[PDB]
């Protein structure tokens, strides 16, 4: 939680390569928010940055299945917290799986969690679909010999509760 | 957006006052989540209508039609068709500034590399399997014998294609080429996407700049507004900040709701085209774009989708006496 | 019969409806709770501000009540308008499906659901409608050698509807969406061009209905 | 972090799927004050000769340190008010 020559702010002070003009004081950003500063006692260009922030997210199978949950810390690096680092943030309490299955509980950036294997919440790169490769050749055609008749329910709102 | 933080930065003094407005803080998250959820529902409805991921055969013989333009590029690390790269360059700090105050950008559920697998599948089945993959198990059919149907769809008897195939090949390929430069040489084609991205980043800037406005309070820094002021008088001041800021969220939130409802409408238009135009053949005049429609090729673009409509436009006329 | 088993144990398939009913009562609830909030005023009870203070002060406080509540309405109202349009578009889609799917047969693909569409049966549901789409989905496939054309005498023969196939010897023309092979005669095929141009034409003999009819 | 989800859900049965519950703000370890006298309040407040109001004396003061403690510890002063200034944060203030 820093104060520089009366400038106050709270951030992560780092070394930085951005180069001031000599007379200048604050670097800034598109938002006018303080970005870079110059250490007065020895001139050096320090960045600034937000704290970890992000939202907490509780990934759970239904409380009917388990009382176990895997916490996702969103958009952070895993320090400030069985841990795993994701694209979407710091995930805790779900064992990574190199296998890839259907997306079940959507998390972020393709990471999708499911409960099954004893058992533990897992996290894995969602397989979009099962894979197929059509067997294709310029004389090859496949004509269905038989059919099914399927009845697929489709459901739509029409009106909503009227009020005054 | 984090309502308690965005309004009251690092101050319990302000944070306690916010409790006296009740559920505003929570109902905003309930609002934005409704948006944020269905966004990944939109992208879900549009791109993945197909049960399986098809992939093109190893060797390309389509009868002269050259899809190396539109098919996934095997040599890119993220496999995306040559065209799609033209798009991702056109469309485009705001990286952490917003993320200072509790304005967060959540990752879209589907990574771009996944979007490019769908639009590979949809495009892989369209080429090999005709339109049948949308109605069930894909059926391999010779592509040149696919286009005999898609002419029967528009009323041109198939004997035209079996005779004009070579010609139609070149017209197709030479048409695909110009699609590159149409995108390559002009940056305004993507304005629709570019406008969406801007307006989002627009309001965020506006929403941020509202933090620096006095709103009638003595200063826009909550510390000086609340800590410097007497714990008695500064209460009334922070109201004008809160009332101002808290309102300023509802403005932003309401905009997003309205704007999302537009996208929600545009998404269905895509999902309609994707289903009817790409997966089937459309009989709806000028729904797939001017001319009699043959087939459509989906292509992903950032927070959007781009269709290449292959259409049949007649040319040369001869006056005939008729009866 | 499968439909009724699904509904028997499925709470989720109605999620679209159940959500709509929820979200209203939700904002309706929240609208009510806003009557308990101070909004900065000394209390959330209207009269209890009055009988505590002499009214010339209450005129000030009741602002922060009204300014609060009046806002909370305009929040709730502006919600409903937005949410109304959301139903509005959904209602338009229902009219479109009711019109095209049930009263017609929709040539549109996957508008009435996966597979080619036969008919739909609407069913009412609270604040909504439920269609039962009866769709025709093909099933069992058989790899077939095919050709886009067939030479006979040097004329080319193309199918009127369907495609020339063979299981590897006898060329059959069949309808596309079902396998129903038929011997190839002029009534199946029309003549266009000749044997040079087509790419993939094969050598075969298109039987003639008429020729045998003569021979007596 | 699990029980908070039940409060957010407002249901003793939390059905499957992910729920945003709370937020964490990493708190800072310590403070950095990185600056690159005495202010004459014994010369102003114990001064011997104030002028009148038609020619009032003005003294620009900077580049020193504030002794704001004994201002409040004086307590021989009739009317002593401050607008937009906090006594606890007066020492903290860096004019
Ligand atoms: C499809 O078109 C691409 C380019 O549009 C062709 O790739 C070119 O192939 C020639 C070989 O004669 C090379 O000289 C070029 O450098 C290639 N260009 C690129 C961009 O790769 C490809 O050969 C065509 N294939 C078919 C089947 O038509
Ligand atoms: C392809 O189908 C044709 C049509 O049935 C077959 O031809 C018949 O084959 C049966 C074999 O049990 C014979 O009894 C008939 O006399 C054949 N009729 C004609 C007109 O040829 C043919 O054998 C099939 N071939 C393959 C490889 O499946
Ligand atoms: C179908 O039959 C035609 C003849 O009616 C074939 O055309 C000739 O095929 C022979 C080889 O068997 C070549 O040496 C000749 O040069 C071909 N014709 C000419 C004029 O060049 C044809 O190859 C057969 N196969 C097809 C076309 O399906
Ligand atoms: C849910 O839990 C109840 C008991 O609380 C049980 O009777 C029911 O079978 C469970 N259902 C599922 C789908 O787990
Ligand atoms: C996390 O920090 C490590 C080093 O501390 C760094 O290598 C890594 O890239 C960081 N990841 C993120 C997402 O910040
Ligand atoms: C996946 O495999 C890699 C080796 O390729 C290994 O390092 C990693 O630990 C594996 N992941 C899990 C979750 O076991
Ligand atoms: C048919 O006749 C009209 C007469 O004005 C003319 O404009 C048109 O060009 C003619 N068509 C062709 C193909 O020349
Ligand atoms: C058609 O051939 C492909 C070749 O890989 C095969 O996988 C497929 O099973 C065949 N069709 C049927 C109905 O067996
Ligand atoms: C079909 O492709 C094969 C390559 O496997 C080729 O030998 C044959 O000539 C092609 N036929 C046509 C009609 O394109």
PDB file of C-alpha atoms in Angstrom, chain C residues 56-215:
ATOM      1  CA  UNK C  56     -41.105  19.626   7.816  1.00  0.00           C
ATOM      2  CA  UNK C  57     -38.278  17.179   8.457  1.00  0.00           C
ATOM      3  CA  UNK C  58     -40.258  14.222   7.116  1.00  0.00           C
ATOM      4  CA  UNK C  59     -40.663  16.049   3.809  1.00  0.00           C
ATOM      5  CA  UNK C  60     -36.889  15.700   3.544  1.00  0.00           C
ATOM      6  CA  UNK C  61     -36.682  12.066   4.610  1.00  0.00           C
ATOM      7  CA  UNK C  62     -39.650  10.826   2.589  1.00  0.00           C
ATOM      8  CA  UNK C  63     -37.684  11.998  -0.430  1.00  0.00           C
ATOM      9  CA  UNK C  64     -34.975   9.435   0.253  1.00  0.00           C
ATOM     10  CA  UNK C  65     -37.798   6.925   0.589  1.00  0.00           C
ATOM     11  CA  UNK C  66     -39.553   8.033  -2.587  1.00  0.00           C
ATOM     12  CA  UNK C  67     -36.336   8.650  -4.488  1.00  0.00           C
ATOM     13  CA  UNK C  68     -35.381   5.147  -3.453  1.00  0.00           C
ATOM     14  CA  UNK C  69     -38.652   3.364  -4.120  1.00  0.00           C
ATOM     15  CA  UNK C  70     -39.489   5.304  -7.273  1.00  0.00           C
ATOM     16  CA  UNK C  71     -36.108   4.265  -8.613  1.00  0.00           C
ATOM     17  CA  UNK C  72     -36.619   0.656  -7.555  1.00  0.00           C
ATOM     18  CA  UNK C  73     -39.789   0.647  -9.623  1.00  0.00           C
ATOM     19  CA  UNK C  74     -38.088   2.089 -12.684  1.00  0.00           C
ATOM     20  CA  UNK C  75     -35.461  -0.591 -12.272  1.00  0.00           C
ATOM     21  CA  UNK C  76     -38.135  -3.269 -12.027  1.00  0.00           C
ATOM     22  CA  UNK C  77     -40.241  -1.725 -14.769  1.00  0.00           C
ATOM     23  CA  UNK C  78     -37.377  -1.257 -17.210  1.00  0.00           C
ATOM     24  CA  UNK C  79     -36.527  -4.872 -16.483  1.00  0.00           C
ATOM     25  CA  UNK C  80     -40.002  -6.094 -17.397  1.00  0.00           C
ATOM     26  CA  UNK C  81     -39.965  -4.156 -20.667  1.00  0.00           C
ATOM     27  CA  UNK C  82     -36.684  -5.797 -21.626  1.00  0.00           C
ATOM     28  CA  UNK C  83     -37.876  -9.163 -20.383  1.00  0.00           C
ATOM     29  CA  UNK C  84     -41.210  -8.640 -22.124  1.00  0.00           C
ATOM     30  CA  UNK C  85     -39.476  -8.205 -25.465  1.00  0.00           C
ATOM     31  CA  UNK C  86     -37.496 -11.370 -24.769  1.00  0.00           C
ATOM     32  CA  UNK C  87     -40.776 -13.257 -24.438  1.00  0.00           C
ATOM     33  CA  UNK C  88     -42.095 -11.106 -27.339  1.00  0.00           C
ATOM     34  CA  UNK C  89     -39.427 -12.517 -29.737  1.00  0.00           C
ATOM     35  CA  UNK C  90     -40.063 -16.042 -28.303  1.00  0.00           C
ATOM     36  CA  UNK C  91     -43.853 -15.549 -28.839  1.00  0.00           C
ATOM     37  CA  UNK C  92     -43.135 -14.489 -32.470  1.00  0.00           C
ATOM     38  CA  UNK C  93     -41.023 -17.689 -32.888  1.00  0.00           C
ATOM     39  CA  UNK C  94     -43.926 -19.760 -31.424  1.00  0.00           C
ATOM     40  CA  UNK C  95     -46.367 -18.127 -33.913  1.00  0.00           C
ATOM     41  CA  UNK C  96     -43.834 -18.894 -36.709  1.00  0.00           C
ATOM     42  CA  UNK C  97     -43.587 -22.534 -35.616  1.00  0.00           C
ATOM     43  CA  UNK C  98     -47.299 -22.830 -34.939  1.00  0.00           C
ATOM     44  CA  UNK C  99     -47.945 -21.358 -38.370  1.00  0.00           C
ATOM     45  CA  UNK C 100     -45.277 -23.114 -40.403  1.00  0.00           C
ATOM     46  CA  UNK C 101     -44.533 -26.305 -38.522  1.00  0.00           C
ATOM     47  CA  UNK C 102     -47.990 -27.409 -37.308  1.00  0.00           C
ATOM     48  CA  UNK C 103     -50.252 -25.826 -40.005  1.00  0.00           C
ATOM     49  CA  UNK C 104     -47.751 -26.557 -42.760  1.00  0.00           C
ATOM     50  CA  UNK C 105     -44.777 -28.791 -43.342  1.00  0.00           C
ATOM     51  CA  UNK C 106     -41.562 -26.867 -42.892  1.00  0.00           C
ATOM     52  CA  UNK C 107     -39.038 -27.132 -45.689  1.00  0.00           C
ATOM     53  CA  UNK C 108     -36.734 -25.150 -43.415  1.00  0.00           C
ATOM     54  CA  UNK C 109     -34.049 -27.411 -41.974  1.00  0.00           C
ATOM     55  CA  UNK C 110     -33.742 -27.894 -38.205  1.00  0.00           C
ATOM     56  CA  UNK C 111     -36.337 -25.234 -37.602  1.00  0.00           C
ATOM     57  CA  UNK C 112     -38.701 -27.965 -36.416  1.00  0.00           C
ATOM     58  CA  UNK C 113     -35.888 -30.075 -34.948  1.00  0.00           C
ATOM     59  CA  UNK C 114     -33.291 -32.511 -36.196  1.00  0.00           C
ATOM     60  CA  UNK C 115     -34.299 -34.674 -39.123  1.00  0.00           C
ATOM     61  CA  UNK C 116     -36.701 -33.996 -41.927  1.00  0.00           C
ATOM     62  CA  UNK C 117     -39.974 -32.769 -40.503  1.00  0.00           C
ATOM     63  CA  UNK C 118     -43.332 -34.505 -40.858  1.00  0.00           C
ATOM     64  CA  UNK C 119     -45.728 -32.762 -38.493  1.00  0.00           C
ATOM     65  CA  UNK C 120     -45.916 -31.129 -35.106  1.00  0.00           C
ATOM     66  CA  UNK C 121     -48.481 -31.441 -32.341  1.00  0.00           C
ATOM     67  CA  UNK C 122     -48.691 -28.407 -30.053  1.00  0.00           C
ATOM     68  CA  UNK C 123     -49.403 -28.903 -26.377  1.00  0.00           C
ATOM     69  CA  UNK C 124     -50.240 -26.131 -23.953  1.00  0.00           C
ATOM     70  CA  UNK C 125     -48.098 -25.509 -20.895  1.00  0.00           C
ATOM     71  CA  UNK C 126     -48.357 -22.808 -18.231  1.00  0.00           C
ATOM     72  CA  UNK C 127     -47.289 -19.555 -19.845  1.00  0.00           C
ATOM     73  CA  UNK C 128     -45.912 -21.369 -22.853  1.00  0.00           C
ATOM     74  CA  UNK C 129     -46.413 -23.932 -25.572  1.00  0.00           C
ATOM     75  CA  UNK C 130     -44.882 -27.341 -26.209  1.00  0.00           C
ATOM     76  CA  UNK C 131     -44.544 -28.794 -29.678  1.00  0.00           C
ATOM     77  CA  UNK C 132     -44.073 -32.471 -30.338  1.00  0.00           C
ATOM     78  CA  UNK C 133     -42.111 -32.555 -33.573  1.00  0.00           C
ATOM     79  CA  UNK C 134     -42.503 -35.755 -35.553  1.00  0.00           C
ATOM     80  CA  UNK C 135     -39.369 -35.952 -37.663  1.00  0.00           C
ATOM     81  CA  UNK C 136     -38.079 -38.504 -40.161  1.00  0.00           C
ATOM     82  CA  UNK C 137     -34.524 -39.619 -39.370  1.00  0.00           C
ATOM     83  CA  UNK C 138     -32.724 -42.145 -41.606  1.00  0.00           C
ATOM     84  CA  UNK C 139     -30.919 -44.998 -39.929  1.00  0.00           C
ATOM     85  CA  UNK C 140     -29.040 -47.819 -41.669  1.00  0.00           C
ATOM     86  CA  UNK C 141     -26.570 -47.014 -44.443  1.00  0.00           C
ATOM     87  CA  UNK C 142     -24.756 -49.075 -47.046  1.00  0.00           C
ATOM     88  CA  UNK C 143     -21.660 -47.955 -48.920  1.00  0.00           C
ATOM     89  CA  UNK C 144     -22.475 -47.745 -52.622  1.00  0.00           C
ATOM     90  CA  UNK C 145     -20.406 -47.166 -55.704  1.00  0.00           C
ATOM     91  CA  UNK C 146     -22.148 -44.402 -57.627  1.00  0.00           C
ATOM     92  CA  UNK C 147     -21.867 -42.539 -60.881  1.00  0.00           C
ATOM     93  CA  UNK C 148     -23.257 -39.127 -61.855  1.00  0.00           C
ATOM     94  CA  UNK C 149     -24.106 -40.355 -65.334  1.00  0.00           C
ATOM     95  CA  UNK C 150     -24.490 -43.379 -67.567  1.00  0.00           C
ATOM     96  CA  UNK C 151     -23.561 -43.649 -71.219  1.00  0.00           C
ATOM     97  CA  UNK C 152     -25.763 -45.803 -73.323  1.00  0.00           C
ATOM     98  CA  UNK C 153     -25.278 -45.256 -77.037  1.00  0.00           C
ATOM     99  CA  UNK C 154     -23.081 -42.249 -76.451  1.00  0.00           C
ATOM    100  CA  UNK C 155     -25.984 -40.247 -75.176  1.00  0.00           C
ATOM    101  CA  UNK C 156     -25.756 -39.422 -71.503  1.00  0.00           C
ATOM    102  CA  UNK C 157     -28.498 -40.476 -69.112  1.00  0.00           C
ATOM    103  CA  UNK C 158     -29.160 -38.630 -65.884  1.00  0.00           C
ATOM    104  CA  UNK C 159     -31.701 -39.551 -63.214  1.00  0.00           C
ATOM    105  CA  UNK C 160     -34.868 -37.514 -63.020  1.00  0.00           C
ATOM    106  CA  UNK C 161     -34.854 -37.862 -59.241  1.00  0.00           C
ATOM    107  CA  UNK C 162     -32.274 -39.736 -57.238  1.00  0.00           C
ATOM    108  CA  UNK C 163     -28.925 -41.108 -58.252  1.00  0.00           C
ATOM    109  CA  UNK C 164     -27.336 -43.936 -60.137  1.00  0.00           C
ATOM    110  CA  UNK C 165     -25.859 -46.416 -57.711  1.00  0.00           C
ATOM    111  CA  UNK C 166     -24.619 -49.935 -57.810  1.00  0.00           C
ATOM    112  CA  UNK C 167     -23.678 -52.506 -55.228  1.00  0.00           C
ATOM    113  CA  UNK C 168     -20.765 -53.236 -57.567  1.00  0.00           C
ATOM    114  CA  UNK C 169     -22.366 -54.820 -60.618  1.00  0.00           C
ATOM    115  CA  UNK C 170     -25.859 -53.782 -61.647  1.00  0.00           C
ATOM    116  CA  UNK C 171     -26.444 -50.074 -61.870  1.00  0.00           C
ATOM    117  CA  UNK C 172     -29.548 -48.981 -60.020  1.00  0.00           C
ATOM    118  CA  UNK C 173     -31.168 -45.589 -59.818  1.00  0.00           C
ATOM    119  CA  UNK C 174     -32.770 -44.917 -56.466  1.00  0.00           C
ATOM    120  CA  UNK C 175     -34.442 -42.123 -54.569  1.00  0.00           C
ATOM    121  CA  UNK C 176     -32.071 -40.255 -52.327  1.00  0.00           C
ATOM    122  CA  UNK C 177     -33.366 -40.387 -48.765  1.00  0.00           C
ATOM    123  CA  UNK C 178     -34.270 -44.080 -48.807  1.00  0.00           C
ATOM    124  CA  UNK C 179     -32.699 -47.077 -50.508  1.00  0.00           C
ATOM    125  CA  UNK C 180     -35.158 -48.356 -53.103  1.00  0.00           C
ATOM    126  CA  UNK C 181     -33.253 -49.651 -56.109  1.00  0.00           C
ATOM    127  CA  UNK C 182     -34.936 -49.798 -59.490  1.00  0.00           C
ATOM    128  CA  UNK C 183     -33.731 -50.955 -62.878  1.00  0.00           C
ATOM    129  CA  UNK C 184     -32.697 -48.077 -65.102  1.00  0.00           C
ATOM    130  CA  UNK C 185     -35.044 -47.256 -67.967  1.00  0.00           C
ATOM    131  CA  UNK C 186     -35.867 -44.125 -69.923  1.00  0.00           C
ATOM    132  CA  UNK C 187     -38.702 -43.379 -67.522  1.00  0.00           C
ATOM    133  CA  UNK C 188     -36.023 -43.121 -64.841  1.00  0.00           C
ATOM    134  CA  UNK C 189     -33.547 -41.097 -66.881  1.00  0.00           C
ATOM    135  CA  UNK C 190     -33.460 -38.167 -69.257  1.00  0.00           C
ATOM    136  CA  UNK C 191     -30.969 -37.623 -72.060  1.00  0.00           C
ATOM    137  CA  UNK C 192     -28.639 -34.634 -72.214  1.00  0.00           C
ATOM    138  CA  UNK C 193     -25.354 -33.917 -73.951  1.00  0.00           C
ATOM    139  CA  UNK C 194     -23.138 -36.870 -74.795  1.00  0.00           C
ATOM    140  CA  UNK C 195     -20.427 -39.013 -73.257  1.00  0.00           C
ATOM    141  CA  UNK C 196     -17.433 -36.696 -73.501  1.00  0.00           C
ATOM    142  CA  UNK C 197     -18.133 -33.943 -71.036  1.00  0.00           C
ATOM    143  CA  UNK C 198     -19.403 -35.638 -67.884  1.00  0.00           C
ATOM    144  CA  UNK C 199     -16.688 -36.407 -65.360  1.00  0.00           C
ATOM    145  CA  UNK C 200     -17.387 -39.827 -63.900  1.00  0.00           C
ATOM    146  CA  UNK C 201     -19.820 -41.221 -66.423  1.00  0.00           C
ATOM    147  CA  UNK C 202     -19.637 -45.042 -66.658  1.00  0.00           C
ATOM    148  CA  UNK C 203     -20.407 -47.606 -69.433  1.00  0.00           C
ATOM    149  CA  UNK C 204     -23.821 -49.343 -69.009  1.00  0.00           C
ATOM    150  CA  UNK C 205     -27.066 -50.278 -70.805  1.00  0.00           C
ATOM    151  CA  UNK C 206     -30.285 -48.470 -69.939  1.00  0.00           C
ATOM    152  CA  UNK C 207     -33.101 -50.928 -70.459  1.00  0.00           C
ATOM    153  CA  UNK C 208     -36.014 -49.730 -72.569  1.00  0.00           C
ATOM    154  CA  UNK C 209     -39.640 -50.256 -71.562  1.00  0.00           C
ATOM    155  CA  UNK C 210     -40.773 -49.921 -75.136  1.00  0.00           C
ATOM    156  CA  UNK C 211     -38.381 -52.158 -77.098  1.00  0.00           C
ATOM    157  CA  UNK C 212     -39.742 -55.481 -75.757  1.00  0.00           C
ATOM    158  CA  UNK C 213     -43.316 -54.219 -76.045  1.00  0.00           C
ATOM    159  CA  UNK C 214     -42.706 -54.068 -79.779  1.00  0.00           C
ATOM    160  CA  UNK C 215     -41.315 -57.445 -80.478  1.00  0.00           C
TER     161      UNK C 215
END
